[PDB]
Structure formats: C-alpha cells, structure tokens
C-alpha cells in the first residue's frame, strides 16, 4: 500500500448522514401520487424509492470501507503506528459496525420490498415504506458514536507523514529534544519546532535528502524518556531499515548529565543492535566507553549549529547504509559568460522581449532581426531564375534566332 491515505472520503456525522440520504431520495424520486393510481404503479413507485434509499446508505458504507485501510494488513510498522494512534479494537469495531449496518440495511430492503410488492392499498404501501426507511434511520441513529470516532481518525490518519519503511531512512533518537530537533532542519528543507522544551515534538517527521544520486529521508523521533506517544518511536526504531543516530550533549545544550543518557542507552541496547548505530554528542570519556563496548557504534563530539559537523556524521551514515581531428570550440564560447540570473546588463532573451511587446502569446515572433547579408538596404524583399550568373550566360543566347528567321520551313 502507498504511504499516503489522504484520499479517504469524509465520514459525515450520523445526524448529517441521515438527512443527506433521506433528502437525496426525496429530490431524486417522484413525489406526486394519488389513491386512484394503479396498484402496480404505486408499488413500483414506492419500490424504487425504497431501493434507492437503501443504495444511498450502502454507497456511503461501501465507500467508507474502501477508503479506510485494514489496520493489520498495511504493514507491521504502520500496523502499530495506526494502533498506537487509533486503538485497534475501536478501529476494528467501527469498521465491523459499518459492515453490520450495511448488512442490516440489505435485510431491510429484502424484507419490506417483498412485502411492499404484494400490497393492495396505498396506505399499506405508504405505511410499509415508512417502516422500511424507519429501521434504516434507527440503525444509523444508534451508530452515531462509532461514526464520530471514524471522522476524527479520518481527518488525522490522512495527515500522517508518508514515511517509507522500505527505502533508506535515517532515524534520530536521544534525550528529548537535546539538539536533535534542530538537526533535521539543517540536513534538508524541513521545519520542526526549535523551542527547547522537553517534548518539543509529539509525532514523527521526515526530511528528504540525496547523496550519491540516491534518495535518503531523515526521521526524527517524538522523544524517549510507558508513554503512548513514546511507543510510536519504539516501533519506528525496530521496523524501519535505518542506522539510528543517538544524540547527547557535553558542554552547551541542556547541561544534562551524560550518566543518565548512558544508562538510558543500555535500556535500548538489546533492541536496536541490528541497525549499526552511531552516537553524536554536542571520567566523561569513561562513561561513553560503556556505550563504546558495542563495536558498531562511535562517539562524535560535534557542534549542532554548523554544517561542517552535520555532514561529518551524515557522510559516515550514508556509507554505513550502503555498506550492507580535434573538437571545435569558437573563441566566442569562452569569451562570453554564464547566464546571470539578475544582472541588469545580462544578455536579454526573447523570453523577456516578449513581455515588452505586451505578453508572450501576443508577441509575433519575427524571423528577421537575425539576418546576415552584404547590406540589407530593403530588409523586406518561376522563381528558380533568381540564381546569379544567369545574366552573364545571356551572351550565348541572343544570336539564336539569326539562323532560323531567314530559312523556309518555320521561316
């Protein structure tokens, strides 16, 4: 499945949903009837309205199931991410209830349509018609609670970032918002709240960048101290192919003790060993030496507010992920200069002269003004006889008639 779900249709509230379907049938079906109408016509008239009303409810329920993905069939990563943000049992219950409501609606049509088609009076068909649509309203009316939950999930699930577990990614982890949040914006074009309070980020972020002509996407964790919000990062670390970067501070940011960070690191050590982790830091060496026990980790003292150190860590991370006759050139070519985007004296182009003539489409492209001639002198001026040297050859053509105008037989 694709990494985007913004196409899910909106789930209207039960109160609005009930009005939409009932009003839709009324406007799209005939209304004029009299007791003197034919019995067969009356039954057919009511049958179409009942059938149309059932289809309207089915369409919305059918479309809802189509748009909403199955929580346990998308991806092991997205499975938990949706579960953590949208409880699985509630999510399944809402979809299951929608299917049950649709099945009941189908039962409503089968039961009453069969009864209606055998009616013999206008009131019987009319009253039974209300009974047919009466249960549909009751079924939908009691479905208000699950419907509200679906809409809230719909307006939030589609907004979730389109993170791709399959492709290369760079996970960011460490003590809550210790320099890590600002790191993502430095790598590439992305925005993250920089205000340094403990949990500056509540959800995941992605920042795309390219190295070796290959796409990469950096991922920022909400924060790790359990908390349900923190649970999102735990599954991201495990089920994402990446080399996670651990963030710490030594001298400038947050002044926090490295002892707590080192001890907290050992808690995650068993889980994320298969990722070739790296450690970035903004008796101290001895404390880090405990983390250095893992051969696949390194400590990089760096500053998180300049590009030189940002690339130093990133360059190593990128390698880690993948570790798994003569030409003719006129002098005028190099005598000129590369196009200047904003120099007023730059060589103006027809793309700009067109605007001077009122616009692009209105400018009449003139094949003239780029002409090579000995001298123009006009600039505006059977046609095979225009080749030069014909006039000179006329000297061998004047005396042709002298040998045929004085001899009989065409005289």
């Amino acid at each position: 499945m694709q990494l985007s779900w913004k196409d899910i249709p909106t789930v209207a509230p039960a109160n609005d949903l009930l009005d939409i379907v009932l009003n839709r049938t009324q406007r799209k079906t005939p209304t004029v009837i009299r007791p003197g109408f034919k019995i067969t016509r009356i039954r057919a008239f009511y049958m179409r309205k009942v059938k149309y009303t059932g289809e309207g409810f089915v369409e919305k329920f059918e479309d809802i199931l189509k748009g909403f993905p199955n929580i346990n069939d998308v991806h092991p990563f997205h499975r938990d991410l949706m579960d953590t943000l949208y409880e699985k049992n509630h999510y399944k219950i809402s979809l299951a209830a929608i299917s049950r409501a649709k099945s009941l609606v189908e039962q409503v049509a089968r039961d009453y349509v069969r009864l209606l088609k055998f009616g013999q009076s206008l009131f019987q068909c009319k009253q039974l018609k209300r009974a047919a649509l009466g249960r549909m309203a009751t079924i939908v009316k009691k479905l208000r609670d699950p419907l509200a939950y679906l809409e809230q999930v719909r307006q939030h699930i589609g907004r979730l970032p389109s993170i791709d577990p399959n492709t290369r990614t760079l996970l960011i982890c460490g003590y809550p918002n210790v320099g890590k949040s600002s790191f993502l914006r430095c790598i590439t074009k992305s925005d993250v709240d920089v205000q340094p309070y403990a949990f500056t980020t509540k959800s995941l972020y992605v920042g795309h960048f390219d190295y070796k002509y290959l796409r990469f996407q950096a991922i920022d964790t909400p924060g790790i101290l359990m908390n349900n919000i923190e649970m999102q990062s735990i599954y991201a670390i495990a089920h994402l192919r990446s080399c996670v970067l651990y963030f710490m501070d030594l001298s400038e940011q947050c002044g926090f003790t490295i002892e707590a960070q080192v001890k907290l690191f050992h808690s995650i050590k068993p889980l994320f060993a298969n990722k070739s982790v790296m450690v970035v830091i903004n008796e101290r060496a001895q404390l880090l030496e405990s983390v250095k026990e893992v051969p696949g980790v390194e400590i990089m003292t760096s500053s998180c507010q300049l590009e030189e150190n940002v690339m130093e860590v990133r360059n190593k991370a990128c390698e880690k992920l993948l570790a798994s006759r003569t030409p003719f050139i006129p002098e005028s070519v190099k005598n000129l200069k590369k196009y200047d985007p904003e120099d007023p004296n730059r060589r103006k182009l027809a793309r700009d002269i067109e605007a001077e003539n009122g616009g692009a489409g209105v400018f009449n492209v003139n094949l003239k003004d780029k002409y090579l001639l000995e001298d123009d002198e006009w600039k505006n001026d059977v046609y095979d006889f225009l080749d030069p040297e014909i006039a000179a050859k006329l000297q061998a053509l004047e005396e042709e008639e002298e040998k045929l105008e004085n001899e009989g037989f065409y005289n």
Partner: protein
C-alpha cells in the same frame, strides 16, 4: 510557391489545384487534373498519349532541349541575396520569355515540310 510541373503532363499545378499520390516509394507523383489521375490508374503510357508534352517532345512534335531550357535547373545551393540580383534577374526573366517566345515563333510550321 514555385509550383511543381505535373509528371504526367508537364503542366504546372498552381496552389489549391491538382491531386498528389504518396507511395511506399513515394517519389511524390502529382496529377494536374482528374483525367491524369484516372488515366494513370488505367496504365496509359505518356509516350502514347497524343495530348501530353511527353509524347510531343518524344515524337518530335516540338523541340526537346534549348539553351534557355537547360537552365530550368531547380538549384538547391542558395547564396546570400541582394536587391540588385533580384532586380537583374527580373530582366533575365523578360529575356528568357523573349528568347523562349522567339523559339516559340517557328516549329509549329517547320513540321509543314512536305506539305508546302
């Protein structure tokens, strides 16, 4: 402009007139009028049709080559133009017509030989 002469009749085909045929060996074939197109399908030989210049020049009805005619010369080596060349070439056209018309002053009575 510079219309092409019909291959089946040598008659120039002015713009918007005549029909053209495109084959796999296209060598574009132009018919001046429906008669040539229909006649071409019937495999009528130009050397036999008495009313086409192909037969008239081949059969000796009129001359085949002349000094001015050799300069038909649908040249494809253009040179930078000038009004003096254009103006002078206009005089050549008048002389070309004059000499060609002068050449058009005799063979339609030369064939009268033997019928004096």
């Amino acid at each position: 402009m510079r219309i092409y002469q019909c291959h089946f009749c040598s008659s120039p085909c002015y713009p918007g007139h005549g029909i053209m045929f495109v084959r796999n060996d296209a060598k574009e074939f132009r018919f001046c009028r429906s008669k040539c197109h229909k006649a071409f399908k019937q495999r009528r030989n130009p050397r036999k049709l008495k009313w086409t210049k192909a037969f008239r020049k081949a059969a000796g009805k009129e001359l085949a080559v002349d000094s001015t005619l050799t300069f038909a010369q649908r040249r494809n080596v253009p040179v930078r133009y000038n009004r003096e060349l254009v103006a002078t070439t206009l005089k050549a056209m008048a002389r070309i017509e004059e000499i060609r018309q002068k050449r058009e002053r005799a063979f339609y009575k030369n064939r009268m030989r033997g019928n004096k």
